[PDB]
Every structure is written in structure tokens, then in C-alpha cells.
């Protein structure tokens, strides 16, 4: 049982932000962009949209309730047949290659626009859009690449070729260093990869795909220890003729497992054995220079940003489904006649405590694409320079900052907030016929892979603030002070936000402290550790309530001008969920701060025993 | 083991040490249980649990209950039938029952610790066991001839359901539709479709099916106080010898395809729809239906909360388990050398926070039903806490809310927690959080939505209560409060108690001022549920403030070992809250005083 169209998309709040809060239609017929206007931006992402509502969400529910199968004598797996058709209306539009490079066959566009579209994708079956990576890792293999390994990467990008990333083992996961598969180099400069890799989403695909290219972490033999002893390998499924792309023999690199998963069933996640069964698996150096950590950040990075738009996607889906939803079920009376048992019974948006919940997740799902589209604008140095003023590097700072909102504080406030979406169902919204249970499902791996939340604000603190010298979240803080220091209307909300800035500033300082204090007393440093998760959510909730609000001048601007009907609602919409965020989740940061300013290590003293 | 993992220590440490049940353990009504048969009768339950209940709890998800259209019947999983059989065969559903229908007299709070372990282990197992529990009610209700069918009904084992809602009639029930007509013979015709029944069928587990329904009588007004209860059994008996007779017109039709709790069957319910009567027996030959049907919903709705509490403390100790053996990363003192010692993830300051934090929402909530429950037996509230019977009955219907609604909310939110402790391996069906989530979404669902608690708590529970039961209980609060080691949880508690006084009366307010603009009420229903979860986080904090009192006294007498650990870990926890949980409420005070009608003015078009 379940929805087959089950995803509502939301191209009208893509656009406003894009078009209407970023100005990223500024930049469209110019320089990299020249050959792309705002017409048709809009068009692709009414063209993916309509695609990911039909063919792509048809066998969302098939992918959870059908999910594949795997051979252990093959080492191969099998999709279910539906879910293979949704890849191929992919393919056959083109999605798999949004944002390539020209070179590669891709359509040159702003990142912004990139992952508005790719939304879609996710929202409707983000699986789908995690086997179709292939030609962006062959974009980031090419960039790292020898001049031999870009033919290499341009026959895979245009044979659109799936791909993986390689780094963790049953002993690391986190702790990426830790890692023990090796390479063993072999006089023709070649290598041989040994070992055996666990998680890997995609390491097989049935037959999608003519052939995988596996991006592995190895440490080489005699390298030192650590992530910075680690090489990346380029490491195909199959041998191939590199100035043809023709397929060849089989390299040794089998898939041995296959995981059985709360969601995201679809994804194969496996277990993948290297050199294990007689055969080498041959890996080329990339780049032919050992740099690995930071040659799979270049993949990390994407992925990051991937996982936390595919949980606000959901959670856009999620709250869409149970708007509708509530828009039509009837169920009870009104709260003013309540004690009248014979009163006209209501829809239940007209229930204080249901509307309190949808506002909830608007604020939120809109927020929190804000958010991602935001980040996306420091992600080209060209859109950074026209939108904002930015120079390239402090762009890339603070495009850095923001990633670790972007996937930490997505995930983690996508899924809590789907508990919303469920609730507005009642009773339904624990049943398989309607789709929120497998939102949910499929998007609580979100704080888990790519790094998990406590990785994330680990990330956040000490590398994006602390080793950043605080120049990227200086900026963003003078953006959010620019904005509080300037019509009358958004007068509380913005007392609110100076409320919030001030909290979080409080914050940043208070863990500083302790990194501080910990040059003396070692013990110290936990502090930090123990608020760090609680920090990033914070900064996150900040961002989300100044991005609404500058969603809602916005509003009131277009307002004032005279909106009608349909844009006068949504308009009405924004500056709705601007205040209801300021007024209701603004304020929480307050105790928060004051939690913070009060940490000590009393449970970092406890006996172990006594938990 | 299993995947339940138990926690008898802490259940024993709440009723022997903190609250003193063992008091009336020996006398009167409990005359004949002592307190260590008490605590036997614990251990062997929670073993029970972890062995042959907990054995099918994988089963019962991975290879779900089956509907059969041929027979209107659903089959079961064979294991699952077994791990009934284990609860049957030792007298387990039969816990709490009264010594006429055959039960041992016991309080309720150590019946409701009992069926923590059945809820823990296999939830749904204990649901389908409630049938000589609603025996009992059926006998409480019925006249002296409906007396004797419910003693057949519990001697025999049959089970039972409550059938309330249908397709237009969840929360309201009051709009339910299904008739009632009677008969010359003074039984009635129940027709009428009923929706999302647990327990419907239930394959061969039982020789018959006690149904409670709700239906309207022709001719009878509306809502609520137009309803009237019917006993409507599976097959027709004899009324004297039990013996099974024609089958009712009582018809499963479909059984719910669901995120979790997939081997309790629900079921839509046909009655009278398949060409033969459902025949029904008015309860008490009275017609006071809700009323009576509120007996069963209260008992549901502890069941339910309790439910969220045990899963969360199987949830936590799981990952606990899995933290203690997980080698990853450096100490956090060593950060910067990529050479230091590997250390296992308990060391990580994110994991013991994630850790204390599942620690003290688990055993506070776990403190806090078994609170409510010493208010459920006169004898109990009046040795243990000084209060009378109808103050008892008072503060027991104002905790009950907060059992179901605070404990269903926040037990899964805290198993967010519990599965990200286990990293990517969380995500795995191996390990048994994933499925702790998915069969615990449904606790904030059935029994009464979030907002249907926290509505009854404000509405029914505090404001028609007059506040009697909330003052009761705030003036406890306040004793502990004004009473050294603990004087800094003793402050942050005075906060907190100010924070949930301070929202009561601005939302008063909003109601009262409602006489002169309607409007004002919406402020209410808007605050209504996050002060639900203030005073759930109120009552947490001064009891885990108590337990680390006791554990205090008890330390400075000397406790050594597990003890000591045991002692050590509570007032960690009790001050880990304090400093962390509490002060939030002070936002949320804020929150709730500047509550506006801006978000129920919008268009809806504007969503
Ligand atoms: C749009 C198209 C895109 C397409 C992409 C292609 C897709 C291919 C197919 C895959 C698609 C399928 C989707 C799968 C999604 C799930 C993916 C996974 O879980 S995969 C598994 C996911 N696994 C994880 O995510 C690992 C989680 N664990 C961590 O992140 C750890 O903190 C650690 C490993 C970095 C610690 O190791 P430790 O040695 O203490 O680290 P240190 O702090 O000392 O830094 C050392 C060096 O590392 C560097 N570098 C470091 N940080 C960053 C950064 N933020 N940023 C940048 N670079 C960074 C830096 O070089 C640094 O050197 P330096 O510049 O300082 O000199
Ligand atoms: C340990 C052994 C236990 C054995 C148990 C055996 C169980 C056998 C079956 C086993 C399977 C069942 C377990 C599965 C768990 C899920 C079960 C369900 O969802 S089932 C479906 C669960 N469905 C729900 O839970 C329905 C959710 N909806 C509600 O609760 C609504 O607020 C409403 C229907 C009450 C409103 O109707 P409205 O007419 O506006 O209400 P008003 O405010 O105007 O009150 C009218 C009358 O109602 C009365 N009464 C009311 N409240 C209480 C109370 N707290 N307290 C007491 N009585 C209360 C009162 O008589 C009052 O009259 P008065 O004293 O004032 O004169
Ligand atoms: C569905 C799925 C798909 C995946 N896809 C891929 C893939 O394609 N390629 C790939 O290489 N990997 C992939 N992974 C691996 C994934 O990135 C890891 O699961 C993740 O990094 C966490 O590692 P772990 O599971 O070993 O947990 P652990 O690292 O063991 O973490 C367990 C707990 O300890 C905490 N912890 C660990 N270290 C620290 C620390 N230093 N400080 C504080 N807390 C800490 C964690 O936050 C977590 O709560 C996938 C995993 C899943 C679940
Ligand atoms: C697994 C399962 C088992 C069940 N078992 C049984 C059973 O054995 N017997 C039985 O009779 N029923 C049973 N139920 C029914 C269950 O109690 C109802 O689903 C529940 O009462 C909610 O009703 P509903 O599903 O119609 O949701 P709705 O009442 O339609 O609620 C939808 C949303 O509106 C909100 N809402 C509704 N009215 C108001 C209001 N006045 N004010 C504010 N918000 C409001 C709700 O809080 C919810 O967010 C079961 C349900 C499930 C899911
Ligand atoms: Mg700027
Ligand atoms: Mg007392």
C-alpha cells in the first residue's frame, strides 16, 4: 500500500528566493552564464518538477516495499523494475548531468540553480538521484585528474557511468584515519587495493550503468598513519579500453553484502571486498600524487550538501502532504464552540494547535531552503561577486561555514519536524497508504552518513570558526546585524533577531572560552565537545529566522506594490511564518546560550558504571 | 541476550526507595504479598520478557499478520503465538485483575511495573492480553447477570477490544454514526463500519472476542452523551455454561498496513454489513456509553504512555551496551595527535551527553508513571503520599495526560538519540532501535492525539478540576524545593516550578478572557501542548531531584559496588536535567505569554 504521487513540489518558493531574495537572475546571460536567461531557468525546474511529481515518485513506494535483491554467487544486486524506469526518464532527460561542466556535456548554470533542481529529484526518490552521481564524481575526478585520467573521466561523464565513494570500514567511520585497506603499488605504476569497505551506497547497480567507478581510500604500503597517510584510487567495476571507453574484463572488486535498512531501502548499501577472490582490483592513483583526505573532501563536500538538501526536500514534501491533508479532513468543532456539542464540525486547519503545527513546518521546510539556496550562492565565485559582493576567497569561507548547517542542522530539524507531518494525519499518518512514515524512514540516515551531527559540529566549531579565524562567520554575523539596523513593520522581528544574534555571539564566545582554558586545564576542551551540537543548531535557527525575515520584506515590498490573489497569498504566507518563527523559536536560543554558559564536566567525570 | 534489556533495579529503587509502596505490602486489600514475592514476581516477569516475549519481536514485524478475505480472519506469526502462549501459560495476562475473576491482589504500581517489561519486550503482546482486563470493567459496568458472563469471559481468557472510531469519528467521537436498534427481546442490532480496531482478530489465540462498542441508540441525541456501550462478543455462548455457540455478525474487512507496531492487527471492523445482526448487550442496561467507555480509555492511555517509556529505556540501554564496546576516534584532549590512543565512543563528551540525556528522560519518566500510579489505589495514596480518595482520584486523572502525552512525545524523541549513539549501524535492522521508533510513533497517535491530552489536561484536568490536583502537586514541589549538595538543583527547580506556574496563568487568562473575546481562546489551543511538556519536564526534574536525595542518604550510609554506581548515576542525572532540560522552560514561559492570534488569522490559502 502507499502514494504513487506522493511528492509535491515547490517551484514558486524556488524561484522567489532565486529570483526575488538572492538576485540570482543577475548573473544569468553573463560571463559563465551567458548562454542561459531567466526564462529558462524557470522552465528547467518546471520541467524537472513535473518529471520528479510523475516518473520519478511512481516507484517511490515500490523502491521501500520491493526492495532489491542481492546474489551472493554474482555479487551482483537487482532493482525492482519500476524503480529502474524512473532512472531512465532521468537519464533520458538529462538529470543525470545538471551543473556538468561544458566540457563534460552539462549545461553550465549557478550552483543555486543546480540544486533547486536536483530538490526535485531527492524529494521524489532521493535514491534515484544518489545512483545518477556518476558524471558529477567524473567531474571531480577529472579536476583531480592527470591529463590521461580526464579522457578517462570524459568517456565515463558522456558513457554516464555510475560511481562511489570508498572510505569506510567496519573500524572507521568516523575516524577515517583509522583505516586499514592498503595498496600495494606494482612496477607498471598501477596498484593493487586490498581490503574490505562497508556502507558503500551504490556499489552495485544492476544494469543500470555499463560500468561503476569506485573512488577508494587506501593507505599505501609504508605510508604513515592517520587520514593524511590515505591515497585515492580510481578503481573501475569493469577493465576498459581507456582511448575507447570499451568495456573489458571484470577488476576484483565484489560486492559480499548488502544491508537490511530502517529506509532509503532502495539505495544498496553494501559491503565491498577488494582483492579478496583471487583477482586484483587494479586502482590508478588519482591525480598520480598521494592526497587523499583532501582529494575525497572534494566528494565529501557535495555529499554533504546533497544529504541536507535531500532532507529539507523531504520535509517540503512531507509538509505539503499534510497541508492537503488537513485542508480536507473534517474533525471537530471550532475551539469558540467548543462546549455547543451541536455545532458545525470544522476542517482541521481551523483547529489553534494544527495550525500551530503547520506553521511549524513552513517556517522550517521554507527556512531551511533558504538556507541551502543561500549557501549555494557562495558556491561560484561569480554569483558571490554579483549577489553579495564577496570576493572568491572569503566565498569559498564561507560557503565552508555554512555546509555543516546545511547537512547538520537540515537533517536533524528535517526529521523532527516530519514528526509534525505525521501528527497532522492522526491515526492515517501511521499507515503505509499515505507517505510520511517512509519520509521519515528514509530521511533519519540524513544525520548519520556524510558524517554524522556531532562530526558535523565538530566541522563547524573547529575548523569553519575556530581555524577560519571567525572571518566567515564575522561576515554572515555583519549580514544579520545589517539587516536588524534597518517601514517599521518587521520592528519586533527584528528586536527578536537582535535577541538571537546576541545569543548566539554569546555562544561563539563561551566555547572559545573554553577552547581557551583548555591550555591550561586539558579537561576543559570537553566543554566545547559538550555544547558544540547545540551551538550549530543555534546558528542554524538564527539563519532560518533572518532569511525568513528578509523573506518577509520582500513580501511586504511586493505587497505594497499591489499583489493579487495568488501571489498576494504566498506573499501573505512569508511574512506569517517570519514572525511565527521570530516569536516562537527565536527565544529558545536565550536559555540555550545560558546552558551553555553554565557546562561543566561532571558527566564527563561520572563512572562509566553509572549510567 | 534479546533485544529487551530490563531494568527491574530501577523499578524496585522508585517503588521500595523513593516512593515506599512497600508500605502497604502486607496489609489489607495486599494482605497476602510481601514485598519480596513483590520483587520476585518483577524479576521473573522481566525474564519472561527478555526470553520467550522478546523472542518474536523481530518475527512480528518482518513477517506481519495476514488478512483473509475467504474467512474475514487474520493469522498471526507462529512465533509470535508462542511468545502469547508463554504469557498465558504463566497467568500474565491476568495481572491486576481482581481476586474474584481469578488475579492477585496487587497496587498498581507494581502492576503497571510488571507490564513495563511485556511492553518493552513485544508491545503488541501485551495488547492482545488485555481481554480479562476488560473483563473486569465489563463486570464493574454490568449488571448482575452481565457479572457472570464477564467472570466466564475472564476464567476463559477471551480477548477484547474497544471500538470507538470510524472513518469521520477519531478525536470526536461523538460524531460516530454506527446505530444501535434494539430488539424485542431486549438485545440490539449494532450496524455500522468501525476503523483502526487493535485486536479485531487475532487468528487462534483466543475461543472468542469480547467487542466494546460504541453505537447510537435510534432516536438518541447527538455527540457524546448520545452514545451507549454495547458488549458484542465474536460468537454467541451460553450465558450460564460459556460453551461457544453461532458466530455474531461481527466481521473484520481489512487489517492496516503500518510504519511499526505491525503484528498488533487493526482492523476495519464490519458490524451487521455480511447479511447476519451483530447482536449486542446494552453494558449496566444503561445508557451511559462515553462515561463507560472512559473506564477502558483511561486504562488505555496508561498503557500507552507506559509503552513509550519502556521502549525508550530498551532503546537507551541498547545503545548504552553498543557505546561501552564501540571503539572510534581520539580522547578529545588529544585531538590534535593523530598517533593517540583509540578510545571507545563513551568517551566522546557528544556521546555521554546523547547518553545522559536518554538516561534521565528514561528513569524520570519511568518515575513518573510509577508516581501516577501510587494515586490509582486509595490505600496506596493514603499510606504512601497522606491524600484521600477523591484528592488521589483528582491527581491520577491530571499525571494521565502527561503519562501518555509527555511520555509518547518525548520517548520518541529520545530514541533519536539512542539510534544516532550506534552511528550508521543505527540505520541497520540488526540492531533493534529502528524498530523501537517505528512501533512507538503510533504512542502520540492512538488513545488520544498529543493535542486531545493536552486539551483534557487544561480543560478537564486543571481548569473544571479548579486547579485542586495541580495545587496538590505543586505544594510538593515547593516542600522539596525549601527542604546543600543539592541546593543548585533546589534553585534551578524554583525556576522551573515559577516558569510552569507563570504559563498556567497566562493561559488561564486567555481562556477567561474568552467570555468577552471569543478569539481569545485560540490562545489556549495554541499554547496548550508545549505546556503539556513543561510540566512534564517540571515533574521529571523534582523527581529525579528526589531519587538523587535518596541516593545521597543512601550513599553517605555507606553503599558500595553496583549500589554506589547505581546511587552515583542518579544524582548525575538529576543534575544533568536540572542544568540542561529545566531552564528552556523559561523561554517557553515567554513564549507562551506573548502568544498572539496573528497565525489563526491567516488565510489558509497563505500555507
Ligand atoms: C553535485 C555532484 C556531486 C557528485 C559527487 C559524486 C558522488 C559519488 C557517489 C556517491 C553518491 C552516493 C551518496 C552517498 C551519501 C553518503 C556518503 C558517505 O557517507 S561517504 C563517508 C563519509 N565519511 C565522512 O564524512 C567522515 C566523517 N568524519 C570526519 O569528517 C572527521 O572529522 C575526519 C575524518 C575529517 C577526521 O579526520 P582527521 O584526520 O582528524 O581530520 P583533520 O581535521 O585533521 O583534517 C585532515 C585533512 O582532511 C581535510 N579536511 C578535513 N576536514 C575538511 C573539511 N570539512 N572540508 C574539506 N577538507 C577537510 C583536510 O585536507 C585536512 O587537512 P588540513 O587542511 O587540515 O591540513
Ligand atoms: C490494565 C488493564 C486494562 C484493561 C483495558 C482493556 C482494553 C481492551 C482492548 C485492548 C486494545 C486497546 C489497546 C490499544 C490502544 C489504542 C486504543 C485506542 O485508540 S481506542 C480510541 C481512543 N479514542 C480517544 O481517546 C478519543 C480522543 N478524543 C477525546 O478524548 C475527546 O476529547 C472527546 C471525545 C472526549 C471529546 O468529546 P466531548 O463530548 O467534547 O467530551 P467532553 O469533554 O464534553 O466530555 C464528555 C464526557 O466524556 C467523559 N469524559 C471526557 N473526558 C474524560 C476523561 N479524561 N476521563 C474520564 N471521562 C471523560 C465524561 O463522561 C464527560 O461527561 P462529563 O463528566 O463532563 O459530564
Ligand atoms: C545508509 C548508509 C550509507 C552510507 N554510504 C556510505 C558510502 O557511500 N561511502 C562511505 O564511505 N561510507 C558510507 N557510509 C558510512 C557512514 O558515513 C558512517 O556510518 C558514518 O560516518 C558514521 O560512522 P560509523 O557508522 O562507523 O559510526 P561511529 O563513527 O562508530 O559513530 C558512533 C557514534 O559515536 C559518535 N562519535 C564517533 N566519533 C566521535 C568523535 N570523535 N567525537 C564525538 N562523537 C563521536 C558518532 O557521532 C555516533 O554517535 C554510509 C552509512 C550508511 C548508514
Ligand atoms: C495503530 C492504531 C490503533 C488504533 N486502535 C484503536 C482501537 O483499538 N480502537 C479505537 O476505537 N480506535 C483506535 N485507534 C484510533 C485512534 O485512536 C485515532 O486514530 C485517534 O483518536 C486520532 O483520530 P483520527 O485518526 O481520526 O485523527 P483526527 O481526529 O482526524 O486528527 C487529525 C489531526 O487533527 C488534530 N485534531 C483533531 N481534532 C482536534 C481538535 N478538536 N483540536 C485540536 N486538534 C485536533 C489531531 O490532533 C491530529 O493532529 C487506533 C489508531 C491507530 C493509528
Ligand atoms: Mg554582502
Ligand atoms: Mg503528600
Given at each position: ?56 515518485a511512481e516507484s517511490f513506494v515500490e523502491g521501500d516495499r520491493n526492495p532489491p535483491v542481492f546474489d551472493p554467487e554474482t555479487h551482483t544486486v537487482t532493482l525492482p523494475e519500476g524503480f529502474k524506469k524512473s532512472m531512465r526518464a532521468l537519464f533520458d532527460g538529462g538529470w543525470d548531468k545538471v551543473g556538468l561542466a561544458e566540457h563534460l556535456g ?31 564524481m567524473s567531474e571531480i575526478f577529472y579536476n583531480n585528474g592527470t591529463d590521461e585520467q580526464k579522457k578517462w573521466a570524459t568517456i565515463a561523464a558522456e558513457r554516464g557511468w555510475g560511481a562511489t565513494m570508498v572510505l569506510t570500514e567496519p573500524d572507521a567511520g568516523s575516524d577515517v584515519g583509522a583505516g586499514r585497506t592498503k595498496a600495494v603499488q ?222 547538520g542542522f537540515g537533517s536533524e530539524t528535517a526529521y523532527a519536524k516530519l514528526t509534525e507531518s505525521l501528527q497532522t494525519l492522526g491515526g492515517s499518518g501511521f499507515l503505509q497508504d499515505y507517505p510520511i512514515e517512509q519520509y521519515i524512514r528514509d530521511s533519519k540516515i540524513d544525520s548519520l552518513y556524510a558524517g554524522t551531527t556531532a562530526i558535523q ?155
Open positions: 500500500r502507499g502514494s504513487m504521487s506522493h511528492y509535491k513540489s515547490n517551484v514558486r518558493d524556488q524561484v522567489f528566493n532565486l529570483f526575488e531574495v538572492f538576485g540570482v537572475d543577475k548573473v544569468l546571460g553573463a560571463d559563465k552564464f551567458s548562454d542561459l536567461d531567466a526564462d529558462t531557468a524557470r522552465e528547467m525546474l518546471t520541467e524537472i518538477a513535473r518529471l520528479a511529481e510523475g516518473p520519478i552539462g549545461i553550465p548554470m549557478p550552483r543555486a540553480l543546480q540544486w533547486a533542481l536536483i530538490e526535485h529529484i531527492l524529494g521524489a526518490n532521493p535514491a534515484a538521484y544518489m545512483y545518477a552521481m556518476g558524471p558529477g606494482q612496477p607498471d605504476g598501477t596498484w593493487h587495493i586490498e581490503g574490505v569497505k562497508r556502507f558503500i551506497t551504490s556499489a552495485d547497480s544492476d544494469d543500470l550503468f555499463e560500468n561503476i567507478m569506485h573512488l577508494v581510500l587506501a593507505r599505501p604500503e609504508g605510508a604513515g598513519p592517520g587520514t593524511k597517510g590515505l591515497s585515492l584510487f580510481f578503481v573501475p567495476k569493469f577493465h576498459f579500453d581507456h582511448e575507447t571507453g570499451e568495456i573489458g574484463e571484470r577488476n576484483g572488486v565484489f560486492v559480499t553484502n548488502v544491508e537490511h535498512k530502517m529506509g532509503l531501502k532502495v539505495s544498496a548499501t553494501c559491503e565491498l571486498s577488494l582483492g579478496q577472490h583471487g583477482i586484483p582490483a587494479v586502482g590508478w592513483l588519482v591525480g598520480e600524487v598521494h592526497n587523499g583526505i583532501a582529494q575525497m573532501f572534494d566528494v565529501i563536500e557535495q555529499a554533504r550538501m546533497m544529504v541536507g538538501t535531500k532532507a529539507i526536500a523531504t520535509l517540503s514534501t512531507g509538509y505539503l502532504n499534510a497541508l492537503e491533508y488537513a485542508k480536507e479532513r473534517v474533525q471537530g468543532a471550532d475551539m469558540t464552540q467548543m462546549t455547543d456539542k451541536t455545532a458545525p464540525r470544522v476542517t482541521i486547519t481551523h483547529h489553534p494547535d494544527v495550525r500551530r503545527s503547520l506553521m511549524t513546518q513552513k517556517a522550517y521546510a521554507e527556512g531551511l531552503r533558504a538556507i541551502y539556496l543561500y549557501t549555494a550562492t557562495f558556491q561560484d565565485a561569480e554569483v558571490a561577486q554579483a549577489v553579495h559582493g564577496v570576493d572568491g576567497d572569503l566565498a569559498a569561507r564561507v560557503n565552508d561555514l555554512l555546509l555543516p548547517i546545511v547537512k559540529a565538530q566541522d563547524f566549531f573547529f575548523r569553519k570558526i575556530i581555524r577560519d579565524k571567525g572571518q566567515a562567520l564575522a561576515y554572515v554575523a555583519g549580514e544579520i546585524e545589517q539587516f536588524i539596523k534597518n517601514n517599521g513593520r518587521l520592528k519586533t522581528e527584528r528586536e527578536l533577531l537582535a535577541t538571537a544574534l546576541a545569543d548566539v555571539q554569546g555562544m561563539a564566545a563561551s566555547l572559545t572560552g573554553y577552547l581557551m582554558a583548555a591550555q591550561e586545564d586539558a579537561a576543559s576542551i570537553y566543554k566545547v565537545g559538550l555544547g558544540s551540537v547545540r551551538f550549530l543548531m543555534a546558528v542554524g535557527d538564527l539563519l532560518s529566522g533572518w532569511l525568513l525575515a528578509r523573506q518577509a520584506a520582500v513580501a511586504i515590498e511586493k505587497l505594497d506594490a499591489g499583489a493579487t490573489g495568488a501571489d498576494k497569498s504566498f506573499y501573505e504566507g512569508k511574512i506569517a511564518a517570519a514572525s511565527f518563527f521570530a516569536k516562537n523559536m527565536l527565544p529558545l536560543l536565550t536559555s540555550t546560550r545560558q546552558i551553555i554558559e553554565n557546562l561543566d564536566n561532571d558527566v564527563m567525570e561520572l563512572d562509566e558504571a553509572a549510567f
